[PDB]
Design a protein around this ligand. Structure first.
Ligand SMILES: C/C(=C\[C@H](C)CCCCC(=O)O)[C@@H]1O[C@@H]2C=C[C@@H]1OC(=O)\C=C/C=C\C=C\[C@H]1O[C@@H]3C[C@H]1O[C@@H](/C=C/C[C@H]1O[C@H](C[C@H](O)[C@H]1C)[C@@H](O)[C@@H](O)/C=C/CC/C=C/C2)[C@@H]3C
Ligand SMILES: [Zn+2]
Lengths: 53, 147, 99, 190, 176, 1111
């Protein structure tokens, strides 16, 4: 009778905390036509050289 | 009748450059979901075919331009690209609509608004509500008027 | 302008959108006619469902699975490239096609 | 009812006069040629195609040749189009005619509707005016804008640019007046 | 013909399927058509696996892969106002009673852990990550309290024995 | 009478009708055995001429044969279709969900022209579903019934449409064929014709005439008497026959350079080649009847002819001129008149054989196209008809017809009248017919040709009035598809017995008498001035010598279900429509008592409905049981009839079958041997007989509500079985496979005591709403764990239990015992869809009582729900202690014009108590025409007043005055039909006598349990975020548009904001609302709905910069 569907994505339930998070850096990437973009990477993480903007 | 649209473009802070188009946006995938049912019978959302046709013809045109071809092939490919974007924005406007399996026309991006099945006509038709119920009715000849 | 929309409104101004505003709303250029993997049922890279462009399918999880906690929030994985956030941002993030 | 609220032209369109005077009633071959002799010195307005299936309007007796009729007197029997009674008898008399004609329908079934429920709808018809002279203030002929907006700028533009626009009351139906609104979001749903 | 067949293998399907799977799917379809015209009925999958020199579970996997998706923009019911996508229960949604049950469970857990001492609640919260979402180990708990890992383990076992009481734990038993 | 085991139902009829009712399912069975080509149909068509009879299959294969290539060097034939037996019998197919099919076998033949061969095989054409003995097909287990269909007959038509700007009657003609190209010969606003060959653009007839091969001289000597054709001759404006072909090609085909060779071959390929233009045999016969061309030759050559085209144009121009007749050169004269589409002379009936034939033809066209393709690509001296033939589009066309079509519907069975009326049902919708929105208002009305061919009463009363009808009783379908009707022929005023079946046209040719005419018992009328029906549907008083046809009987113009209403001639047409429509929604009760007063149609309509086991041959009963009857025939052989006990119908009702014969009895052929669902002793029984008063009682029976006694609840008088069917399937997934077992995670062992060791419940266990029916557990996979769930598992030591429970639970508001369990398994090698290993079906049944809210109705449209069930003490009892059963209301009787229920009530009281008139001084005057053996009757005796010839007022009143008492000498009901009631509640008598009697009421299929429906919070939708809709789910009510108008008109803005934000779409708001109600706080402020943000994302996606501004 009834037909059910499911997108392939897990749904959690937690509290959106704003105070205590894992800290993180910011790096600037530069494209060919003078565009700049800032990507927040994690702290304990390697900073890759090139990055698709 | 021409000064109408000429003063319309002059009076506002618009520009006539945006009637030709150079980048096409993509609606988010939760509004066009590919959900599976019970048993793996997948259910797409009928805009992904239009987006796939636009992506395919654009990639083929890029390959043809990088390759270098005579003018007939490039003009045919650009005409097909233009008709793909036209079918994406409004199917069935220019000539025969792009159809799917069983001669059924695909619900394009503008068909979510107009018609009896659009967003506007539904949103004026009303939603369905929680905390409701129905049943058959019978006469209540002992109740008071506010009961 | 207002992108958070906390219930105070005065005007709803329509207007004709340009190429700059179109490529300024977008979060990445979709460049492949692929939707989902046929075997593992996961979204492809640079496709019409790509988790780098539109966001994560699962709540607070990157694509490669390195970060899975709410403590990592607002950051982008170094390998897969998915910003860790809620799975309702796939409702709202838009992409663009470069003709 | 629907042809009255839409302000369409009717089927049995009996004509109306434009000025007083005795009539030049003439019953031609298979269709009548009704001309009106004006009371004062004026032109004789001729009505061309009045078929014999239409009937003479009975009033005060049957219609006769040389009947001294009034200004907006209905000529034959039937129903006058309200566009013509507006241009002839102004804005007050068309409101009297539009209410009384609708209220004649509902009385046939003994249905009681108070007139203020109809006077709200008739108020929404005559809100706009036509433009025949643009003046010197951002206007175009053939435009239909609000009466409250046409006069309010004409209160100010008579100083420093005193070319006032020429306005006239128009009667438009419900289906037409509902589209010309100030909100695009409401008119999108129509 | 090579380029046309390659493009038909690439772009003629909604979800993308590689070239060798397209080839074996078309082989399976041609062999099923031939056996349908010959036998007169639909072939058994074991007979198809016998014909194609593979296993019947591989035949079932290929038949699973061959299923094209259906569209969401048709009319299911008699009236065309009912589209297909208006009869799909979103099974990955929020049930809206488990959420308030989770909040009530968090509040009861906070009260129950407050019925213990300060050090016991501290070591349990830092053991199970109840306050930040990071499960620390006995080394980190003995570092933040200045004692051995074994003393922390003893305190943890003592508290786990303390919580395993009916009087202390019936209100938590009813949550599962 | 004429049925051996019949109950003695004494009739009130005066007319002795000659003709009995025909076979009620012949409209299905004759058409299907015409399509097969059965030998029974062969001799039946040999009974009336037809020296060359052909089935539908051989007709299709003969109009296909032969197939030829572009060169004509190879040819394929088709001949001799023959069938096998059916592969599996009826009950086994209905059990295992297989269709009821049989194989086709066709001898194909391939002939090589160049070197000389035949190649004769026996090509298996495909499986083919077969009609059962009740006119029903079986598709995948269910029972489907193909509905017939009315279409417009192909041929010529004529009409005029006057324009008031022209004041001229502008004629027209549409020669509409089957499967062809349209063409018209209009007349324009001027005095010129317009020839719109297939609908490009208008043209004059001189272009097509010179294109046909005609000169102006032949134009003049054929068309010689109209200024219209002379003015078009002077306005021909294009000189040249080849120029006319060039102009025709240039006008018909756009964007193509014209040529003089292919244009002349195009026109012969468009209208005179019998492969792309085929008006049918019916259409050719209709055209030859209309123009009088072919008068005595058999109907062949299904393409057009130029003689027919020029005769059409001559007929059109002489109708435009205005005549009374015209003879064609070489043919008989014909009257000139226009044509009516709604007439049944132009509206044939595409029955089930025609529909199956059209589907087979449209399959064989694609199969022929594949053959014509692979005729060339294959190599010669290697191929054969086994290699050339692909049967899969034919079998796909058949399987695509029987499922997923408009005309193939489920058999509406909840009582055997409903099956009988779902067959013999005539519609105008469906493929090949007009749409509902495009339905003209004139095609919904009753044409005067419907007398005896279609019921003007029985039709659906929604937005489908007149589009769907049913056949009449004595009607019959021609071989051509027109509808015949019997008539008694009468010569010189003496009414004979020669019954002649007329159609609509030759009905119009003659004049037609009346059924109830006073005949002198010698053949002749008693008055010269008789009622009669003229040609155009008029009603006159003709002298009694022009009459040449009489009706056979009354009730000829009525359907089957409408012929079961007593005193139909006293009811209005709307309420008789409602009564005949509600007579088939009745449910089968558990006792099924026969009605007291009825018509004579119950017995035939029951034993023709097929739901009654009839004795096939005369013999003696050997052994009865509750499950089978074995009879012993006159010569040795025995046969056993397996009953159906508690079988589920298509709508949940029950289908019991109990015997009515004893051990030692002797039966005859055709005698009823076993009752059905709604039968008693042979005849139909849809309800019970109940005492009824017509007083208004305390406002409980206010505005058509009904109150009942408690005796009907106590004594199971209105109770019925209902059987529901649940289903679950253990598929296979990526992570593993779902398993059916008992080990359900996190579920107590208290509710796991019902089901057996393998998961399913046991037979006999009573289930409540929400119990476990089939234990099913799925693999789920791995997820992260929240710290609180981790700590609770660490405290309690319960394991992970990685598998997820998705069991089968009984839905909300259901209960009852468990009858049967049917399980299909992969290891037992049954057919299943791909990836499913175990299918298990559980049948739950419950015994629904009567309750307030349930809907009851009589046989006259007097419906109404049950308002209150009073106890048996406070119910207005009669003069001797008998309490009444139901209490109707007075005010609903006179303003609906259905006092047929009052006459039924009076005659029901007379038939219950029993009467005996006094023949001491002879028969009284009112009972002179009253037939014999009705002068006295026992109590509880059945009677039958037929439809239009039944009881009269004087007969009923005099019979009601003499109505012999019960036990003591107490005539409880006086001469007016009333009685002195007592108030059971206060105690005093009611001060005025009240009408009482015995009515017949039925319980309808609108029970409360299928309607009561509620929702607090349940399943939500996927694309939009609104709550889901439908009683099958939890489901929320639609707060529509006019309700928003009402909430705006009240001024209540806050309730409207709540109803459109936090009850439908505010996804972050619904959880906060539920939390605030549970914790007991104030409801928070609503946010932006989801629909508006979806609209915003679409408008941004459509290259429109939509921006929200604040200041
Ligand atoms: C609207 C319609 C059929 C409706 C579904 C039912 C009749 C509506 C009239 C009414 O309200 O009484 C038209 O039906 C045909 C073609 C076009 C239309 O179909 C349509 O456009 C609509 C549906 C067409 C085919 C549906 C096939 C399957 O859908 C399910 C299973 C299959 O059939 C459906 C069941 C049909 C039997 C019905 O029968 C009716 C009562 C119930 O409504 C049903 C039990 C009875 O009135 C029955 O005696 C009369 C049937 C009408 C005979 C066929 C006429 C033409 C059931 C819902
Ligand atoms: Zn990742």
């Amino acid at each position: 009778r009834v037909l059910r569907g499911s997108r392939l994505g897990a749904v959690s339930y937690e509290t959106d905390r704003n105070h205590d998070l894992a800290p993180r850096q910011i790096a600037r990437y530069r494209t060919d036509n003078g565009e700049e973009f800032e990507v927040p990477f994690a702290d304990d993480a390697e900073i890759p050289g090139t990055w698709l903007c | 009748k021409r000064l109408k649209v000429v003063a319309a473009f002059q009076q506002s802070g618009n520009s006539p450059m945006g009637m030709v188009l150079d980048a096409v946006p993509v609606i988010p995938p939760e509004l066009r979901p590919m959900v599976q049912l019970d048993g793996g019978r997948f259910a797409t959302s009928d805009l992904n075919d239009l987006y796939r046709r636009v992506i395919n013809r654009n990639n083929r045109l890029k390959r043809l331009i990088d390759l270098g071809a005579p003018e007939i092939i490039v003009n045919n490919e650009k005409r097909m690209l233009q008709e793909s974007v036209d079918a994406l924005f409004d199917n069935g406007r220019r000539g025969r609509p792009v159809t799917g399996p069983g001669n059924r026309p695909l619900k394009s991006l503008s068909d979510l608004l107009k018609g009896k099945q659009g967003r506007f006509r539904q949103n004026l038709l009303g939603k369905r509500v929680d905390y409701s119920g129905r049943s058959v009715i019978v006469v209540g000849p002992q109740l008071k008027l506010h009961q | 302008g207002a992108m958070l929309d906390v219930n105070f409104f005065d005007e709803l101004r329509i207007g004709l959108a340009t190429a700059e505003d179109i490529r300024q709303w977008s979060y990445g250029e979709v460049k492949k006619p692929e939707t989902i993997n046929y075997r593992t049922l996961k979204p492809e890279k640079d496709g019409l469902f790509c988790e780098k462009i539109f966001g994560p399918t699962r709540d607070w999880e990157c694509y490669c699975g390195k970060y899975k906690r709410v403590r990592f929030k607002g950051i982008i994985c170094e390998r897969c490239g998915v910003e860790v956030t809620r799975a309702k941002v796939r409702r709202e993030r838009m992409g663009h096609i470069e003709l | 009812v629907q042809e009255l609220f839409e302000a369409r032209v009717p089927r049995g369109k009996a004509p109306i006069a434009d000025v007083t005077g005795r009539v030049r009633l003439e019953d031609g071959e298979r269709f009548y040629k009704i001309t009106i002799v004006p009371d004062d010195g004026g032109e004789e307005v001729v009505y061309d195609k009045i078929s014999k299936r239409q009937r003479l309007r009975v009033f005060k007796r049957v219609l006769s040749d040389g009947d001294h009729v009034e200004v907006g007197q209905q000529l034959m029997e039937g129903s006058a189009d309200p566009h013509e009674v507006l241009r002839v008898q102004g804005p007050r008399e068309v409101q009297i005619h539009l209410v009384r004609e609708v209220q004649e329908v509902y009385r046939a079934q003994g249905v009681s509707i108070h007139d203020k429920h109809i006077e709200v709808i008739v108020r929404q018809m005559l809100r706009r005016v036509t433009i025949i002279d643009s003046g010197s203030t951002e206007f175009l002929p053939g435009s239909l804008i609000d009466r409250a907006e046409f006069e309010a700028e004409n209160r100010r533009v008579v100083a420093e640019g005193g070319e006032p626009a020429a306005g006239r009351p128009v009667l438009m139906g419900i289906t037409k007046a509902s589209l010309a609104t100030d909100s695009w979001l409401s008119a999108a749903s129509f | 013909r090579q380029a046309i067949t390659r493009a038909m293998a690439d772009q003629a399907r909604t979800i993308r399927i590689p070239v060798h799977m397209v080839e074996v799917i078309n082989k399976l379809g041609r062999i099923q058509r031939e056996l349908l015209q010959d036998l007169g009925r639909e072939p058994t999958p074991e007979e198809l696996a016998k014909e194609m020199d593979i296993t019947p579970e591989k035949v079932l996997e290929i038949q699973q892969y061959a299923r094209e998706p259906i569209s969401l923009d048709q009319t299911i019911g008699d009236e065309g106002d009912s589209q297909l996508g208006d009869f799909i229960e979103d099974s990955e949604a929020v049930v809206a009673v488990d959420a308030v049950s989770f909040t009530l469970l968090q509040d009861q857990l906070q009260s129950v852990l407050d019925t213990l001492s300060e050090r016991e609640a501290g070591v349990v919260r830092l053991r199970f990550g109840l306050t930040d979402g990071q499960p620390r180990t006995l080394d980190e708990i003995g570092q933040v309290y200045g004692v051995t890992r074994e003393r922390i383990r003893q305190i943890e076992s003592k508290t786990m024995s303390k919580l395993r009481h009916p009087s202390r734990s019936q209100v938590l038993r009813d949550y599962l | 009478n004429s049925v051996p085991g019949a109950p003695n139902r004494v009739s009130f009829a005066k007319l002795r009708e000659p003709l009995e009712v025909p076979g009620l399912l012949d409209v299905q069975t004759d058409s299907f055995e015409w399509l097969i080509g059965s030998p029974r149909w062969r001799e039946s068509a040999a009974e009336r001429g037809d020296v060359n009879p052909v089935g539908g299959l051989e007709e299709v294969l003969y109009e296909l044969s032969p197939i030829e290539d572009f060169s004509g060097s190879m040819s394929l034939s088709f001949s001799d279709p023959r069938f096998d037996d059916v592969k599996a019998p009826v009950d086994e197919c209905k059990d295992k969900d297989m269709t009821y099919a049989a194989p086709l076998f066709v001898t194909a033949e391939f002939i090589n022209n160049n070197t000389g061969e035949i190649k004769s095989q026996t090509v298996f054409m495909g499986d083919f579903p077969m009609m059962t003995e009740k006119g029903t097909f079986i598709i995948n287990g269910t029972e489907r019934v193909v509905v017939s269909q009315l279409v417009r007959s192909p041929g010529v038509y004529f009409d005029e449409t006057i324009d008031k700007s022209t004041d001229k009657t502008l004629h027209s003609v549409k020669v509409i064929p089957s499967r062809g190209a349209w063409l018209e010969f209009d007349v324009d606003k001027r005095d010129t014709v317009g020839v719109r060959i297939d609908r490009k653009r208008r043209q004059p007839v001189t272009v097509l005439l010179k294109a046909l091969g005609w000169t102006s001289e032949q134009i003049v000597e054929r068309f010689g008497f109209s200024e219209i054709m002379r003015s078009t001759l002077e306005k021909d404006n294009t000189v040249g026959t080849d120029e006319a072909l060039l102009d025709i090609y240039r006008k018909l085909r756009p964007g193509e350079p014209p040529t003089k060779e292919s244009a002349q071959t195009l026109l012969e390929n468009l209208f005179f080649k019998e492969k792309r233009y085929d008006l049918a045999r019916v259409g050719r016969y209709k055209v030859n009847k209309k123009l009088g061309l072919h008068v005595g030759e058999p109907i062949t050559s299904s393409t057009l002819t130029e003689e027919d085209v020029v005769a059409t144009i001559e007929y059109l121009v002489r109708l435009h001129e205005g005549q009374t007749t015209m003879t064609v050169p070489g043919g008989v004269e014909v009257p000139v008149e226009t044509d009516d589409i709604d007439h049944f002379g132009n509206r044939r009936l595409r029955t089930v054989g025609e529909l199956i034939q059209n589907q087979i033809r449209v399959g064989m066209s694609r199969m022929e196209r594949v053959v014509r393709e692979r005729m060339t690509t294959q190599d010669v001296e290697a191929i054969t008809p086994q290699t050339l033939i692909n049967i899969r589009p034919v079998v796909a066309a058949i399987k695509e017809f029987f499922g997923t079509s408009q005309l193939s519907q489920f058999m509406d069975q909840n009582n055997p009248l409903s099956g009988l009326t779902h067959k013999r049902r005539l519609s105008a919708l469906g493929p090949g017919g007009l749409s509902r929105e495009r339905a003209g208002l004139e095609v919904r009305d009753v044409h005067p040709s419907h007398y005896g061919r279609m019921c003007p009463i029985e039709t659906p009363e929604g937005p489908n009035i007149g589009l769907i009808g049913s056949l009449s009783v004595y009607a019959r379908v021609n071989p051509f598809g027109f509808i015949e009707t019997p008539y008694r022929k009468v010569v010189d005023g003496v009414v004979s017995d020669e019954i002649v079946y007329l159609t609509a046209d030759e009905e119009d040719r003659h004049v037609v008498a009346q059924a109830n005419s006073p005949i002198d018992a010698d053949g002749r009328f008693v008055e010269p001035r008789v009622l009669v029906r003229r040609k155009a549907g008029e009603v006159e008083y003709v002298p009694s010598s022009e009459v040449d046809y009489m009706d056979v009987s009354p009730r000829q113009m009525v359907s089957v279900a409408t012929a079961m209403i007593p005193f139909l001639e006293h009811d209005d047409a709307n309420r008789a429509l409602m009564g005949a429509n509600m007579q088939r929604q009745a449910v089968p009760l558990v006792r099924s008592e026969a009605p007291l007063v009825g018509t004579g149609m119950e017995l035939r309509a029951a034993i023709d409905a097929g739901d009654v086991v009839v004795a096939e041959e005369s013999g003696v009963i050997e052994e009865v049981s509750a499950d089978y009857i074995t009879v012993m025939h006159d010569n040795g052989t025995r046969r056993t009839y397996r009953m159906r006990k508690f079988a589920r119908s298509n709508h949940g009702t029950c289908a019991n079958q109990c015997p009515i014969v004893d051990a030692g009895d002797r039966v005859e052929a055709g005698q009823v041997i076993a009752d059905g669902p709604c039968t008693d002793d042979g005849e139909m029984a849809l309800g019970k007989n109940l005492l009824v008063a017509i007083m208004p009682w305390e406002g409980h029976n206010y505005e058509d509500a009904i109150i009942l006694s408690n005796r009907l609840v106590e004594e199971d008088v209105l109770t019925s079985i209902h059987i529901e069917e649940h289903e679950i399937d253990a598929r296979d997934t990526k992570l593993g496979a779902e398993e059916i077992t008992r080990d359900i995670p996190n579920i107590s062992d208290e509710v796991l005591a019902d089901l057996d060791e393998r998961g399913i419940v046991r037979i006999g266990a009573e289930v409540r709403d929400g119990d476990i029916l089939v234990g099913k557990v799925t693999p789920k996979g791995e997820t992260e764990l929240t710290p609180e769930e981790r700590l609770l598992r660490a405290i309690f030591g319960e394991k992970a239990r990685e598998v997820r429970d998705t069991s089968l639970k009984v839905p909300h508001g259901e209960s009852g015992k468990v009858i049967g369990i049917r399980v299909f398994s992969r290891e037992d090698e049954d057919e299943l869809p791909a990836g499913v290993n175990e299918l298990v079906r559980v049948y739950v049944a419950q015994k629904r009582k009567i309750s307030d809210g349930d809907k009851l109705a009589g046989r006259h449209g007097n419906k109404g729900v049950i308002g209150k069930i009073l106890p048996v003490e406070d119910m207005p009892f009669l003069a001797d202690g008998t309490p009444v059963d139901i209490i109707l209301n007075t005010h609903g009787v006179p303003r609906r014009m259905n006092i047929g229920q009052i006459l039924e009530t009076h005659l029901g009281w007379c038939a219950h108590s029993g009467w005996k008139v006094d023949a001491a001084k002879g028969v009284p005057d009112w009972a002179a025409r009253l037939p014999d053996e009705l002068l006295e009757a026992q109590p509880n005796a059945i009677v039958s007043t037929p439809v239009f010839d039944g009881a009269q007022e004087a007969e009923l009143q005099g019979l009601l005055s003499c109505t012999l008492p019960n036990r003591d000498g107490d005539v409880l009901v006086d001469a007016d039909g009333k009685a002195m009631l007592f108030d059971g509640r206060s105690g005093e008598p009611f001060p005025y006598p009240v009408t009482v009697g015995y009515m017949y009421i039925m319980k309808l299929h609108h029970l409360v349990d299928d309607k009561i429906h509620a929702r607090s919070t349940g399943p939500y939708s996927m694309i939009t975020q609104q709550p889901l809709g439908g009683k099958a789910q939890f489901g929320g009510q639609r707060f529509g548009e006019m309700e928003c108008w009402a909430m705006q008109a009240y001024g209540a803005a806050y309730t409207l904001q709540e109803l459109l934000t936090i009850k439908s779409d505010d996804t972050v708001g619904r959880v906060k609302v539920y939390e605030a109600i549970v914790k007991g706080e104030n409801i928070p402020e609503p946010g932006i709905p989801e629909s508006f943000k979806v609209l915003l994302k679409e408008l941004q996606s459509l290259c429109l910069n939509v921006e929200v501004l604040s200041s």
